[PDB]
Amino acid sequence: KVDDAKVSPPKRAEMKTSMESLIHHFKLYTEGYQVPPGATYTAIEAPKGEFGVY
Amino acid sequence: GVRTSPTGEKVTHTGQAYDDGDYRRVRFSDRQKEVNENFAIDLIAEQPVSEVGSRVISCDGGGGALGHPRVYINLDKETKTGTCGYCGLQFRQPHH
Amino acid sequence: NLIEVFVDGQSVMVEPGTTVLQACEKVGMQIPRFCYHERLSVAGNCRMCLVEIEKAPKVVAACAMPVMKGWNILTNSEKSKKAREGVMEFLLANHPLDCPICDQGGECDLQDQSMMFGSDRSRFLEGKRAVEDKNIGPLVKTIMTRCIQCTRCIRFASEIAGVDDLGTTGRGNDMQVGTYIEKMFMSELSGNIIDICPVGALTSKPYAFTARPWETRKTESIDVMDAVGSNIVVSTRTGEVMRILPRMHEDINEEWISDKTRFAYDGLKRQRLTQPMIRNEKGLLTYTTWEDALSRVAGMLQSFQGNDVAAIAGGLVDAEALVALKDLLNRVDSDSLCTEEVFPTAGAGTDLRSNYLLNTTIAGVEEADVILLVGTNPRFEAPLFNARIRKSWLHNDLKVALIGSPVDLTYRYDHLGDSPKILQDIASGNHPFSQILKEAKKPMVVLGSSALQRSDGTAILAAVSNIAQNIRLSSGVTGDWKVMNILHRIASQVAALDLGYKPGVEAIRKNPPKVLFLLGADGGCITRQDLPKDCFIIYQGHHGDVGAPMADVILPGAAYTEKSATYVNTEGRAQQTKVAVTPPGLAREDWKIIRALSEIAGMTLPYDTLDQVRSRLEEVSPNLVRYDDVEGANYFQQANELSKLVNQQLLADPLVPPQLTIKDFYMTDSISRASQTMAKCVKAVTEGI
Amino acid sequence: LGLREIRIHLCQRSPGSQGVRDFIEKRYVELKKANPDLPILIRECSDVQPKLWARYAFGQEKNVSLNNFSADQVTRTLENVLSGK
Amino acid sequence: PTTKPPTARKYIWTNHKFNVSGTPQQYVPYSTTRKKIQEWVPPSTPYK
Amino acid sequence: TSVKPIFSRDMNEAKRRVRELYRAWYREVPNTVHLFQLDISVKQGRDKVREMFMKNAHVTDPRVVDLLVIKGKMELEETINVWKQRTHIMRFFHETEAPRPTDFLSKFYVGHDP
Amino acid sequence: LIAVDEKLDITTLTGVPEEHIKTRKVRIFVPARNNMQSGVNNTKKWKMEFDTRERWENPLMGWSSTADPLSNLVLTFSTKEDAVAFAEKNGWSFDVEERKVPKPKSKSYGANFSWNKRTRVSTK
Amino acid sequence: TRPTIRPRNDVVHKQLSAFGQYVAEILPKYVQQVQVSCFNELEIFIHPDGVIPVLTFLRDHTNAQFKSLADLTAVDVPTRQNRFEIVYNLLSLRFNSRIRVKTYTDELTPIESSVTVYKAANWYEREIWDMFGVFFANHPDLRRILTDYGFEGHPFRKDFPLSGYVELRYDDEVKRVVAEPVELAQEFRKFDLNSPWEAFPAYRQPPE
Amino acid sequence: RFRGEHALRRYPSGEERCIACKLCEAVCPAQAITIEAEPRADGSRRTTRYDIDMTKCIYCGFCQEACPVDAIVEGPNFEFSTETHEELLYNKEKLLNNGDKWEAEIAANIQADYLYR
Numbered sequence A: 001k002v003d004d005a006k007v008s009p010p011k012r013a014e015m016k017t018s019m020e021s022l023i024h025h026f027k028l029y030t031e032g033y034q035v036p037p038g039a040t041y042t043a044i045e046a047p048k049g050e051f052g053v054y
Numbered sequence B: 001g002v003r004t005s006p007t008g009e010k011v012t013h014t015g016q017a018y019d020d021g022d023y024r025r026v027r028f029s030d031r032q033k034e035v036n037e038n039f040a041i042d043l044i045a046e047q048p049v050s051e052v053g054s055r056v057i058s059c060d061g062g063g064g065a066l067g068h069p070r071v072y073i074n075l076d077k078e079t080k081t082g083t084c085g086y087c088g089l090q091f092r093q094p095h096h
Numbered sequence C: 001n002l003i004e005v006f007v008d009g010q011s012v013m014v015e016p017g018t019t020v021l022q023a024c025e026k027v028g029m030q031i032p033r034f035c036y037h038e039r040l041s042v043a044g045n046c047r048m049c050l051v052e053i054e055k056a057p058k059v060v061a062a063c064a065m066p067v068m069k070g071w072n073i074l075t076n077s078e079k080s081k082k083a084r085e086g087v088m089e090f091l092l093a094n095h096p097l098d099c100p101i102c103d104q105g106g107e108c109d110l111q112d113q114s115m116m117f118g119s120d121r122s123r124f125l126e127g128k129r130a131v132e133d134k135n136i137g138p139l140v141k142t143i144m145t146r147c148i149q150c151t152r153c154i155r156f157a158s159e160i161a162g163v164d165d166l167g168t169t170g171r172g173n174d175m176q177v178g179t180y181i182e183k184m185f186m187s188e189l190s191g192n193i194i195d196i197c198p199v200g201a202l203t204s205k206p207y208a209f210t211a212r213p214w215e216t217r218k219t220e221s222i223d224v225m226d227a228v229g230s231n232i233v234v235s236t237r238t239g240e241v242m243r244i245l246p247r248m249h250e251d252i253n254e255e256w257i258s259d260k261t262r263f264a265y266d267g268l269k270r271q272r273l274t275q276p277m278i279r280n281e282k283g284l285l286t287y288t289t290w291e292d293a294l295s296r297v298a299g300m301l302q303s304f305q306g307n308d309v310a311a312i313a314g315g316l317v318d319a320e321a322l323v324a325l326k327d328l329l330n331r332v333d334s335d336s337l338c339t340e341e342v343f344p345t346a347g348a349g350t351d352l353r354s355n356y357l358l359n360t361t362i363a364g365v366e367e368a369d370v371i372l373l374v375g376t377n378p379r380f381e382a383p384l385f386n387a388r389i390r391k392s393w394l395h396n397d398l399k400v401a402l403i404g405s406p407v408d409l410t411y412r413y414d415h416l417g418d419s420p421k422i423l424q425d426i427a428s429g430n431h432p433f434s435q436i437l438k439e440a441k442k443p444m445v446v447l448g449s450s451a452l453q454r455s456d457g458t459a460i461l462a463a464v465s466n467i468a469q470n471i472r473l474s475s476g477v478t479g480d481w482k483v484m485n486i487l488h489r490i491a492s493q494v495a496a497l498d499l500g501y502k503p504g505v506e507a508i509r510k511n512p513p514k515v516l517f518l519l520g521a522d523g524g525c526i527t528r529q530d531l532p533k534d535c536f537i538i539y540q541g542h543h544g545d546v547g548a549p550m551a552d553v554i555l556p557g558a559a560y561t562e563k564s565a566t567y568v569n570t571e572g573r574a575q576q577t578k579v580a581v582t583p584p585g586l587a588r589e590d591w592k593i594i595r596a597l598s599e600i601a602g603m604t605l606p607y608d609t610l611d612q613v614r615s616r617l618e619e620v621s622p623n624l625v626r627y628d629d630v631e632g633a634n635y636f637q638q639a640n641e642l643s644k645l646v647n648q649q650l651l652a653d654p655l656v657p658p659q660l661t662i663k664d665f666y667m668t669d670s671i672s673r674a675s676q677t678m679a680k681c682v683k684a685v686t687e688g689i
Numbered sequence D: 001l002g003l004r005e006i007r008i009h010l011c012q013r014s015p016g017s018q019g020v021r022d023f024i025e026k027r028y029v030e031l032k033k034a035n036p037d038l039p040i041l042i043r044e045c046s047d048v049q050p051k052l053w054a055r056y057a058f059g060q061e062k063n064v065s066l067n068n069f070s071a072d073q074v075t076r077t078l079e080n081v082l083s084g085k
Numbered sequence E: 001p002t003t004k005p006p007t008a009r010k011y012i013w014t015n016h017k018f019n020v021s022g023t024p025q026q027y028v029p030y031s032t033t034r035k036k037i038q039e040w041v042p043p044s045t046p047y048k
Numbered sequence F: 001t002s003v004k005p006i007f008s009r010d011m012n013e014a015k016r017r018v019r020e021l022y023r024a025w026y027r028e029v030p031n032t033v034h035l036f037q038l039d040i041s042v043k044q045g046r047d048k049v050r051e052m053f054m055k056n057a058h059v060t061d062p063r064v065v066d067l068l069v070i071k072g073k074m075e076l077e078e079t080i081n082v083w084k085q086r087t088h089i090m091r092f093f094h095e096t097e098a099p100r101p102t103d104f105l106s107k108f109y110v111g112h113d114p
Numbered sequence G: 001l002i003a004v005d006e007k008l009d010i011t012t013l014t015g016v017p018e019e020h021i022k023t024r025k026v027r028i029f030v031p032a033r034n035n036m037q038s039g040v041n042n043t044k045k046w047k048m049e050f051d052t053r054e055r056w057e058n059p060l061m062g063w064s065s066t067a068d069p070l071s072n073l074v075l076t077f078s079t080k081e082d083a084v085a086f087a088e089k090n091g092w093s094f095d096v097e098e099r100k101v102p103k104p105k106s107k108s109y110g111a112n113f114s115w116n117k118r119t120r121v122s123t124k
Numbered sequence H: 001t002r003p004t005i006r007p008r009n010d011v012v013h014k015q016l017s018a019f020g021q022y023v024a025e026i027l028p029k030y031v032q033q034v035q036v037s038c039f040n041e042l043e044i045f046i047h048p049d050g051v052i053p054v055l056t057f058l059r060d061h062t063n064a065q066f067k068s069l070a071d072l073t074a075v076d077v078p079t080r081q082n083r084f085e086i087v088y089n090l091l092s093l094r095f096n097s098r099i100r101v102k103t104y105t106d107e108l109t110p111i112e113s114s115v116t117v118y119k120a121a122n123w124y125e126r127e128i129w130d131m132f133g134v135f136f137a138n139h140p141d142l143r144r145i146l147t148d149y150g151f152e153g154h155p156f157r158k159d160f161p162l163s164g165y166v167e168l169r170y171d172d173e174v175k176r177v178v179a180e181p182v183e184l185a186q187e188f189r190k191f192d193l194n195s196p197w198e199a200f201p202a203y204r205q206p207p208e
Numbered sequence I: 001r002f003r004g005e006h007a008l009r010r011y012p013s014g015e016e017r018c019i020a021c022k023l024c025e026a027v028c029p030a031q032a033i034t035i036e037a038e039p040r041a042d043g044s045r046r047t048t049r050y051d052i053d054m055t056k057c058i059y060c061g062f063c064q065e066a067c068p069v070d071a072i073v074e075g076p077n078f079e080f081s082t083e084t085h086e087e088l089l090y091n092k093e094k095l096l097n098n099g100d101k102w103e104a105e106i107a108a109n110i111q112a113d114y115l116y117r
């Protein structure tokens, strides 16, 4: 996963030993990461055709 | 440490027990009330106190990464023991 | 004149002496902070607000650095970001891993500013510091391992509360915040240190572990525990009142609330009236139905009429309930309507609002030059008014003088004896303080309404009005400044006086009633010893304290947190309490109860909804529907002329306030008496330790 | 027939309430002195016309519009209520 | 478990139970929290 | 301010479309009762159609009237094509809801509702 | 392009019940700043929320029950005028609260060491 | 290298900007605004009555062969006078590109149906109508697609409650399913998650 | 890694691991968890109500990911079908009984898979 504790949670050992990691785990699992404003349409070739998300 | 209410109903570790006039006791007729017999408060009271010769000790609950976040307890107050509040574990400096 | 500074290249005109933080605030950028509070003095120690000036090689503390002409502030520059990251790194290097077991949790400035301005990883490979916890009373819980030594509590304590028992002992990394001795920080403004502490070192002890910030629903209502009318926010969760927090109103509240307001919310969960009650053959109170209770009360109301019908309004009643009871008693031509608090009716009386209002508003104290307090203890009667006086004292050298008992206010004041003879002496001109008031550019005379409970309240009011008249004659006549003031300690008093209630229960004492409606009247002014034999008593209220024990019929009503209602504070401002929870059990809204009683009795009232009841309120007094307005007409000349014609003699007794100590502060009304936390506070301040 | 109280509502800044304001300033003190036990509640309006409510026995009330009245007109209307005509 | 017995705790059940649904020993839910609001108890002595 | 009309221009044509839809619904109630095997009368169905038309009698915007008749045509073609079941047709009648009190005294007795 | 001299009213189109159209008073306001935090980023947009209704206790499991559809409905608006327009066109009653912004305050670090004024602090 | 940061494509950004200028020049009567997001997505804001000409141009033009309609939906923004925002997503296979066309409408203003430009617009506009209340003028069969028969209200609107106003159960007395006002044993617990500290300074709005 | 029936775990001393932090309640997608807590007799931060509606839960494993003390876990049990709806509305006593019943296997699985977390 992306090595960015403001987006992806830290490891359990880091969360239980590091204050920054514990804070980021708390915030990610309570509030969640903020996403910059904007709209996107991303599509993939799912087995049934184009599957997209706007 | 389970205890029995005056109506014969077991009292949970949260002190929950329906009153005598409470109609909601009907749900237990011809059935049972789910009560956990082990009381964490009683067990942690049964646990002893660890004596360490340091002003500050660290507790992670045992097991390392399988326990709780590591915290530091200041053992300077000689009138009481320092309790790690993640696991309720008491530590103390050697007196006498 | 304004100077031009730049924030990120955007021009902004700021007054000289403005700081970098305030310039960024003007352009809409909130600089991170831990020690800076706009209501407190500038400390500049947490170092979190360091920003870069365009040409300056060195970062500046934005909270303490005045802006210079042509300064470009780079708020989102690399140097500023690195400085924030380093400061947060030090803070979290020594901070403990207590977030899940910490009540600050999801409303912590350390967590949020770490997620927004700090790094996501730790380089601290050493051991952490653990600090012994102090004990400063039963209200504030201290876990000082989480303290970041920002000295917000120390500065607030000293400057705002006038209590200098907080500070830093030791030095270096071993520097600790506390009293250095086993002393309880007991004050009427003790929870605001819980509010201003950015971390979980100072947390509410009654609120401990109960909830988390994201769960709570916020209901913006006002406060009823006193007559200040503080703006609060009630935090609920699954239909249960969880917490009380301050809500900013810079003209009344100013981000602070008293301890009685903050920590008496747990008295709403005990001794509550939930079902209508009547009396059986044995004379014992037993539960019944609304239909039966209202039928009995309506039968009595139909049987009796005229001055045989009385009502006593308590201290936590609202305008809608007051007007509904007034109209219901008027339907039978009855008029024994009274409040359980005395105001002099001789002369103008309650005819003119600028005779019992606090004409100089709470925010108007900051503009005054001299203030004279007569027969009051504002530290306990109105803690936020006393806090405003302390702020004016500190920031303007306001000259405070107190006539009467030397209560321990939080600031130095000039003491004038204990007797109203000094009040007469000032009016005549013998006292030097008369010359002080004459030479004052802005005087203020605040007579506490607790002094009017005396047998000579009319004489005291006449004396202070004469002093104000002497001030007006000697000083310039022109100007909108108002000198005469009245300080109320009861929430419902101003609304009742506006509606037309007769202050004090003297009318009911004069003519004993056959039927008595105790509308939240728990003061015990009138009892069955005074009442005639076999008097019929209906107590409508939310707590069973006095009236419910001595009542024949009991009608459960709603609390302020449970009903949408109107209250008028001591300065005449009207505010609406909103609904946070619903009344427990079979309890109903107060005006709804009165309207249903009228319908059953056959004298149906002309309003069926809250909007219609407030239309009736507008009919009786439009200031009860103009909410945020505080401006009003001045009728001091007429009030003084009407006070002159009839005069009596002042009693030769010292002016002793009802509340001399913080215990008397803690226990004042029904909710506070039913609260366990207030009992803990009283026990702590009496037995110590 | 049995008057119980009088309520005079006047806005403090609108021109239409100038006559009512003059009555309060220079004529209210004499009225109150003659009627010590009569509740004469003077209140404030925002933008509506001035009003004169008279609450009689058993909760009957009559309102008289005081818009653009003079001090003499207000005095005459008020003494009509007290007399009963 | 014969070759690698599990760690023994004083709170682990000594006797295992199968699914007891449809029997009097079945689980019946209830609220585990006390009463939120305490109501006023009128005096038992006469008045007046 | 001039706005794009959905239909009907002024109010007269909207009233005309309302009358057309009312005729279409009025001539359909016997078929609805026959096909769905409703235990209600034809008069009951016509009265329900009249009642549902009458609760929008206060509308003074031609575009709102046009949208209302569009939705009425939609729910009519759901009835004609038997896309609806007897469930929805009888949902129109609220046959299972208890009669809500409407007077102040009863509302005060039952609960805290306005 | 037709001209309509009428106020916008879509209550008949929204599908809301008459009870929840007539007996509902929304509150248009800017939320007060959370006193536990110094941030002011939640006090920038106007909010519209309804009046609190009854919540009772579920006989089973003791949960918090409700019968009010609009208990959790909060709408966000950029302007008091926009919120008022939305409330008017949806037909609910509304109470408007004027936005409260902190008044500007004069700060000075040098006042902590005044020669003759009370602003001198006894501790740092 | 910056392994945790998404790489950018200036070539595609410039190409999209150039094509946006191209279409804006070709259709000044309808195109109101052209934007290129920093992750290389072209977005066109047009007048609501230019839908048919703009879509037909983007489909049939030789230099813009957006022969496929990827998606068609709406967004509800109650703070706007025209709360509903219709969004068209088009895919050009010949040039291996995608485009977005956005228009606006309110409750009482119809939008021309694009079933004569793309056949998928039939069901897409049926869903838009059913879920937001937007009426499409020339639609072969406009009716509800997803909601229950006789369902009142458009649920994807921001002002529509999450649980709606009615709920279903089987009543034994009437021997059929009935619809009654919604009543929840446990109320949906609403959470306030937003932090009071600004996250992205790049998006800060003027105080105004 | 299998996600089956839920369980509340204990420390080896017998003390409950849960500290009423409500991270699982906050992160639960289906809002299946209801938590109420207060200070205990000895001052511990412990729950009084910990309910999981197993007919509302989607068995996604988010609660055991967000737990900082390994209190709430998803055990190996999956054969716990009942005859009545109410029997699937677990409360704190039921979850503690599940933990005491399945502690050995739960501990073994967590030991096996904890280095990947």
Ligand code: SF4
Residues within 6 Å of the ligand: A023, C095, C096, C097, C098, C099, C102, C103, C104, C105, C106, C108, C109, C110, C111, C146, C198, C199, C200, C201
């Ligand atoms: S004060 Fe803040 S950072 Fe420190 S343990 Fe509490 S929530 Fe975590």
Ligand code: SF4
Residues within 6 Å of the ligand: C146, C147, C148, C149, C150, C151, C152, C153, C154, C177, C196, C197, C198, C199, C201, C202
């Ligand atoms: S206890 Fe809190 S307010 Fe006081 S210095 Fe420490 S962090 Fe600041």
Ligand code: SF4
Residues within 6 Å of the ligand: I024, I027, I028, I029, I030, I031, I032, I033, I052, I056, I057, I058, I059, I060, I061, I062, I063, I064
């Ligand atoms: S597995 Fe997922 S849905 Fe189930 S209780 Fe845990 S977090 Fe909630």
Ligand code: SF4
Residues within 6 Å of the ligand: C100, I017, I018, I019, I020, I021, I022, I023, I024, I025, I035, I063, I066, I067, I068, I069, I070, I071, I072
């Ligand atoms: S995440 Fe763990 S410690 Fe926190 S409330 Fe849930 S079970 Fe308890």
Ligand code: FES
Residues within 6 Å of the ligand: C032, C033, C034, C035, C036, C043, C044, C045, C046, C047, C048, C049, C050, C061, C062, C063, C064
């Ligand atoms: S906020 Fe400026 S140094 Fe603390």
Ligand SMILES: [Mg+2]
Residues within 6 Å of the ligand: C104, C193, C194, C195, C196, C197, C198, C199, C200, C201, C202, C203
């Ligand atoms: Mg705090």
Ligand SMILES: [Zn+2]
Residues within 6 Å of the ligand: B059, B060, B061, B068, B084, B085, B086, B087, B088, B089
């Ligand atoms: Zn531990």
